[PDB]
Design a protein around this nucleic acid. Structure first.
Ligand SMILES: Nc1nc2c(ncn2[C@@H]2O[C@H](COP(=O)(O)OP(=O)(O)OP(=O)(O)O)[C@@H](O)[C@H]2O)c(=O)[nH]1
Ligand SMILES: Nc1ncnc2c1ncn2[C@@H]1O[C@H](CSCC[C@H](N)C(=O)O)[C@@H](O)[C@H]1O
Ligand SMILES: [Zn+2]
Lengths: 284, 705
RNA sequence: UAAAUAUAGUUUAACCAAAACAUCAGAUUGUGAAUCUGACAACAGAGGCUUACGACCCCUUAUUUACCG
């Protein structure tokens, strides 16, 4: 590719540019069809190396630090096998959740509204969100609805989980949540809903739209809910928090941690602990 | 507090180390009769405005053209068509907190500023420094402005100021990549100051070879220049053509002019002597013309909203109506037309607004309940019972403005036109840009309307209700001349103090009092003192010309010397208009059994405490006064910014109450139809209504807190 | 309408420049696994400029405050 015609002086020009690039990275560079977009991507691609080597340099510096102390310097009940035992324990709990647990739906029908940066970030929040469900005392039955098998979102999920994808204790499906559940019990959670969520209802299916629009697109989740006949609710952030800073649309890992706290009889004081403290000045 | 002055040192001493990167010239007023002629210059560090005409502030805010960053306002003539509406502009500048604004033009703005202080509050907080043409050259971080006074062959009414602007030289780009092969350390904080020398072009000794820096720097822009010149009429063509200063910029090849804006009518341009003048500038110089030949829309939102309401009822909401090859090529001015001067000289036509009605209707039906409600109302009214009481088509009430104080995209400041008969009319209030609303509402018929305008009433010395009065007078004189009718002074009923502003303007700025026959509002009251006989035959003219059986007035509860009104016709119908004021008992005694009542309804229900703080009423109090009026119908106007697009509908809204909009016609034969227009109304304004109910809720949370 | 702001896991720090705590996959761990090997690291967004940068300038969305002679 001739796209090297930009990089090979942009390094000499004085802008921050990474030294190691591949054709796969080079391909995504040419979709950036403006000077600022290319500069923004190159800045991201440059800082990837910057924290890599800095953390790289840290780790073998530690290797010398421990190898000198490790080489120079009884009755037990259990073998030290806890990480294996914890994973098995969460597996049994997840298997029980898939049968009797309350369903929670992550709507994957937002692939067409996301750029590559946003789509990748959605998976990262999805990975953390499902991780917190596993470690909970009373896990949800997590559903991935509207997830196209060949779609971009599915391929990214497979790449991140690798072998674990086929072994996850969650129900991923092509069908919409309206096909799996009665339309009366579905409550599409969205920040733009005019109805404020008062109490957590254990006989309802809460739908979270897996949409991370860093280029914020208000009303997208509400439009989907009103395109169907689904009811909507919004978190009582204004009721219990003194907001000052930032968007009121929380991340997927914060949302699931708020719902999990509510499901475990926690009040709104404990549940809203997971709203970033940088966005408000205390609970009232 | 504005970012413009707080981030001052970041801008740099000589700009950002030499010149601004981008500079274009945008037209906010293409020269139409209603909108006037105005020009806007954008730069990285400064923003300029030319010929701040009446209603220009409305156009600059509606087109997202920031006002809190303006530095100088250049006026080419000491004339109301060019200076009018500046009083509103300085109030807007004061609101934003801008400390200092510089005015330029004829030396008479010294007297103009002291003249407008009669009505406007002493502008505390904002510095107004008038810089006349006799002052030295004004140099800024971006550009240099040259002021040339031009005197016609015939205060001083023959003075015209023309501006020859000149952009400062911008330091060129630095060929940083080639400097490596020479040996320059591109690395940051490594012999960087050479770049400043590279910008300057001075030689620097590097790698044992002191080279002239322009070798490693792009050829710097010498700085394109543009000229702002206005030729009001024929008597200014000759002095402009023979102006010595202009020869220094057109005949020379070292100082080209990129663009020349021409604020002159069509008749001036076709003149042969003026024709030779543009070609003398050179074939390179583009020419822009702003005059009445422009055919474009400015108040797009007003046109947009008017078309949508026109679907509900065409008669009640009439549609707004818009009002020879040349040797030298020239480009007609259009709204938001741009001409970039740096780094490329080109005609940027992208931002020009388009006025396509079809979209505006299309937007209407896709609304949730608009199409159903309009259709439901149409069959109920057109194909239902008798269409109201059988009464005459006159009088008809024209609501040219329903704005509380500042103009807004949807509503202009208060101005109401009453058509007593087809051959006579009167103005109940004349706010800023009232003629613009008059011209937009009638189009080619504005001159006929001005010919039938017999009297003007002014409620209180508040500027929202009277600052547009001068603009009517010059247009009325032109309209009367076009119709051939003899020129006679207009009848104005207003408080005595209104003469103070007019006397100041007439003796210092421009002759306008010869069109004025002012009748003080004090002698119009009931049981009033017998005044001088000179006023006495004027009061007979008021009743005779306007066919009024009686014309009453009283002091309404507001700022001192504030007055209400009451029209009584020989036929019998009685129209009572109340300016800004809380429920007043004197008003109640005035218009008992009035046919129609127009009342101030500025605030919501639940804001009574600042309603008295601002001497202003709410909807329920205004409605309750209407019941105390025992009036057939009630009209609400003078809505505040909070009711930006639509008044909130209180449960007290009965069949005897109604809401007013801009360019909305109300006749006595439409009274029962007005309540029937409500169901369509929230249907179109549904997204807007939900904004009001929540912001009403937000204040409750503050009260609860 | 204007000014302040806007960290997509969370905080801190900020012209310091990357941390600390977390997250995902693999691990049969002899009790420092308190680890190892990998995955992901975008300070609202889209554009301009500039040798550059998080700076500077428009624009979009949003948040908190104020908002008429
Ligand atoms: N002073 C003041 N003006 C406000 C306030 N809220 C809204 N406005 C005014 O209302 C305008 C609304 O702007 P827009 O939202 O573009 O207006 P719109 O008529 O809804 O037009 P669209 O956005 O195209 O739908 C603002 O630009 C202000 O002029 C407020 O709190 N204070
Ligand atoms: N304050 C809040 N209350 C309820 N749900 C919220 C919320 N903030 C975020 N969410 C949920 O978290 C998900 C990602 S936030 C993104 C929402 C979407 N981009 C929009 O503009 O509407 C959404 O599906 C939303 O349902
Ligand atoms: Zn008023």
């Amino acid at each position: 590719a001739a796209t090297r015609e930009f990089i090979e002086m942009w390094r000499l020009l004085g802008r921050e540019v990474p030294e190691h690039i591949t054709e796969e990275e080079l391909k995504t560079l040419m979709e950036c069809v403006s000077n600022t977009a290319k500069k923004k991507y190159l800045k991201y691609l440059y800082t990837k190396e910057k924290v890599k080597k800095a953390r790289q340099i840290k780790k073998e510096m530690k290797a010398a630090a421990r190898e000198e102390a490790k080489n120079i310097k009884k009755n037990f009940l259990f073998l030290r096998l806890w990480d294996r035992n914890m994973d098995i324990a969460m597996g049994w709990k997840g298997a029980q959740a898939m049968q009797f647990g309350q369903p929670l739906v992550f709507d994957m029908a937002y692939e067409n509204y996301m750029k590559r940066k946003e789509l990748q970030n959605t998976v990262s929040q999805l990975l953390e969100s499902e991780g917190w469900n596993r470690r909970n005392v009373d896990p949800f039955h997590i559903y991935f609805c509207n997830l196209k098998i060949d779609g971009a979102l599915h391929r990214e999920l497979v790449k991140r989980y690798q072998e674990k994808w086929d072994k996850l204790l969650l129900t991923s499906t092509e069908k919409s949540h309206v096909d799996l559940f009665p339309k009366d019990s579905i409550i599409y959670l969205t920040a733009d809903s005019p109805n404020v969520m008062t109490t957590f209802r254990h006989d309802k299916v809460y739908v979270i739209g897996s949409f991370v629009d860093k280029s914020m697109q208000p009303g997208t989740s509400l439009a989907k809910a009103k395109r169907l006949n689904l009811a909507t609710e919004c978190l009582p952030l204004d009721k219990y928090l003194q907001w000052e800073i930032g968007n009121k649309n929380l991340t997927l890992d914060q949302m699931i941690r708020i719902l999990l706290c509510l499901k475990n009889n926690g009040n709104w004081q404990e549940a809203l602990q997971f709203v970033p403290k940088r966005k408000h000045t205390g609970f009232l | 507090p504005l970012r413009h002055l707080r981030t001052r040192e970041k801008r740099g001493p000589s700009g950002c180390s030499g010149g601004p990167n981008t500079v274009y010239l945008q037209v906010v007023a293409a020269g139409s009769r209603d909108s006037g002629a105005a020009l806007y210059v954008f730069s990285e560090f400064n923003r300029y405005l030319f010929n701040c005409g009446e209603g220009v502030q409305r156009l600059m805010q509606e087109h997202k053209l920031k006002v809190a960053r303006l530095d100088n306002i250049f006026l080419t003539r000491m004339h109301w068509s060019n200076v009018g509406g500046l009083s509103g502009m300085i109030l807007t500048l004061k609101e934003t907190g801008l400390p200092k604004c510089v005015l330029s033009g004829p030396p008479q703005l010294e007297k103009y500023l002291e003249a407008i202080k009669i009505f406007s509050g002493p502008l505390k907080g904002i510095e107004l420094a008038v810089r006349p043409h006799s002052a030295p050259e004004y140099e800024d971080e971006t550009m240099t402005v040259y002021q040339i006074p031009i005197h016609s062959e015939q205060r001083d009414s023959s003075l015209v100021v023309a501006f020859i602007c000149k952009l400062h030289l911008k330091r060129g780009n630095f060929l940083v990549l080639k400097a490596k092969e020479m040996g320059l350390p591109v690395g940051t904080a490594a012999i960087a100051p050479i770049i400043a020398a590279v910008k300057d072009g001075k030689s620097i000794t590097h790698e044992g070879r002191e080279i002239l820096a322009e070798e490693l720097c792009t050829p710097p822009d010498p700085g394109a220049a543009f000229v702002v010149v206005e030729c009001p009429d024929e008597s200014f063509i000759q002095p402009i053509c023979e102006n010595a200063t202009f020869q220094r910029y057109q005949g020379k090849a070292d100082a080209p002019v990129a663009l020349v804006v021409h604020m002159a009518p069509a008749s001036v341009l076709v003149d042969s002597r003026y024709q030779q003048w543009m070609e003398r500038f050179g074939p390179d110089t583009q020419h822009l013309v702003l005059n009445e030949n422009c055919a474009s829309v400015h108040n797009l939102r007003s046109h947009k909203i008017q078309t949508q309401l026109n679907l509900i009822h065409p008669d009640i909401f009439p549609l707004l109506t818009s009002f020879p090859t040349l040797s030298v090529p020239m480009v007609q001015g259009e709204c938001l037309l741009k001409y970039q001067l740096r780094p490329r000289r080109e005609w940027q036509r992208d931002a020009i607004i388009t006025c396509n009605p079809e979209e505006f209707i299309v937007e209407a039906l896709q609304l949730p309940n608009f199409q159903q409600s309009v259709q439901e109302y149409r069959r109920s009214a057109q194909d239902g019972p008798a269409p109201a009481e059988k009464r005459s088509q006159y009088p008809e009430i024209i609501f040219l403005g329903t704005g509380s104080a500042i103009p807004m995209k949807i509503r202009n400041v208060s101005a109401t036109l009453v058509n007593i008969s087809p051959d006579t009319s009167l103005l109940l209030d004349c706010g800023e840009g009232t003629f613009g609303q008059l011209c937009r509402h009638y189009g080619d018929q504005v001159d006929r309307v001005l010919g039938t305008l017999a009297a003007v009433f002014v409620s209180h010395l508040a500027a929202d209700h009277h600052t547009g009065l001068p603009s009517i007078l010059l247009q009325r004189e032109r309209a009367l001349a076009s119709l051939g009718k003899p020129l006679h002074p207009l009848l104005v009923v207003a408080p005595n103090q209104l003469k103070a502003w007019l006397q100041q303007y007439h003796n210092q700025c421009q002759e306008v009092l010869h069109h004025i026959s002012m009748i003080p509002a004090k002698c119009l009251q009931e049981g009033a003192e017998i005044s001088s006989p000179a006023v006495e035959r004027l009061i007979s003219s008021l009743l005779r010309t306007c066919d009024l059986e009686e014309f009453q007035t009283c002091l309404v509860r507001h700022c001192k010397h504030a007055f209400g009104c009451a029209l009584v016709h020989t036929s019998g119908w009685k129209v009572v208009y109340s300016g800004d004021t809380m429920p007043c008992e004197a008003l109640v005694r005035m218009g008992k059994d009035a046919t129609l009542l127009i009342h101030e309804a500025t605030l919501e229900d639940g804001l009574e405490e600042e309603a008295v703080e601002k001497t202003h009423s709410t909807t329920s109090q205004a409605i309750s006064v209407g019941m105390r009026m025992n009036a057939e119908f009630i009209m609400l106007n003078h809505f505040s910014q909070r009711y930006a697009k639509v008044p909130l509908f209180s449960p007290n809204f009965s069949e005897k109450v109604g809401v007013a909009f801009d360019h909305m016609k109300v006749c006595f034969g439409d009274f029962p139809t007005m309540p029937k227009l409500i169901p369509p109304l929230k249907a179109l304004f549904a997204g807007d209504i939900e904004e009001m109910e929540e912001r009403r809720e937000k204040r409750e949370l503050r009260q609860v807190r």
